[PDB]
């Protein structure tokens, strides 16, 4: 029931917590609503849902950038690096965020405006062959009982990654990630009373296998959507 004194890490944790909540609404503090564009059977692509989903995707990527600039030291990196980090982590954070909006008993996921889609609608909106992979991840997350604090730190840790190809100052990025890992660890300790640190980090590796496929889902969607892929989505997954 005792913990050492860690003032500075506690401030960082708080800043990242706020940065997260403020750039990503809580499921409970959200006015969920339903649609039905094609909740009955899975189809190649429900254009009506894609239009909505793609609009929500554009906005959430915007918020992620907003979240990135709120991370201590992020803006201190070079512009090229910031862009590099964002492009490499965007999808990972997107998956993590949507899966945090999972309502297991109704098997749905809620978007930032409240739109709540079920598994079939998620598929028809554009996830296609990823639907199951993402839902499984959402389910494997429930036992961890992560809060916005942990989600923000985990997202921050995923973003600020020195092992990204093309970084001009990797060691500078590595220096920013250290406090984050330690803050996540320290935090897990006071909260969860006691082997969750490695367990939660291991989830980053699960995210990579899913984001790996998401890159190929973009190519596929390009050939099936009416116009062109929303520009911001193109910059982040090209």
């Amino acid at each position: 029931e005792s913990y050492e004194m860690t003032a500075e890490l506690d401030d960082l944790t708080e800043k990242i917590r706020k940065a997260h909540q403020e750039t990503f609404p809580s499921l409970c503090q959200l006015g969920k609503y339903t649609t039905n564009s094609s909740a009955d059977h899975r189809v190649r692509l429900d254009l009506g849902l894609w239009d909505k989903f793609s609009e929500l995707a554009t906005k959430c990527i915007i918020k992620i950038v907003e979240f990135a600039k709120r991370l201590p030291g992020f803006t201190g990196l070079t512009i090229a690096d910031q862009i590099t980090l964002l492009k490499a982590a965007c999808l990972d954070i997107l998956i993590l965020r949507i899966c945090t909006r999972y309502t297991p008993e109704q098997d749905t996921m809620t978007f930032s405006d409240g739109l709540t889609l079920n598994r079939t609608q998620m598929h028809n909106a554009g996830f296609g062959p990823l639907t199951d992979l993402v839902f499984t991840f959402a389910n494997q997350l429930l036992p961890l009982e992560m809060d916005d604090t942990e989600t923000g730190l985990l997202s921050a840790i995923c973003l600020i990654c020195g092992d990204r190809q093309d970084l001009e100052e990797p060691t500078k990025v590595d220096k920013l990630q250290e406090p984050l890992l330690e803050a996540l660890k320290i935090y897990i300790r006071k909260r969860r009373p006691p082997h969750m640190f490695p367990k939660i980090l291991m989830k980053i590796t699960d995210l990579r296998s899913i984001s790996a496929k998401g890159a190929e889902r973009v190519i596929t969607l390009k050939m099936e959507i009416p116009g062109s892929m929303p520009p911001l989505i193109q910059e982040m997954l090209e």
Partner: peptide, 8 residues
Amino acid sequence: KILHRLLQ
């Protein structure tokens, strides 16, 4: 670029 503007 959109990223540049948003980051600038």
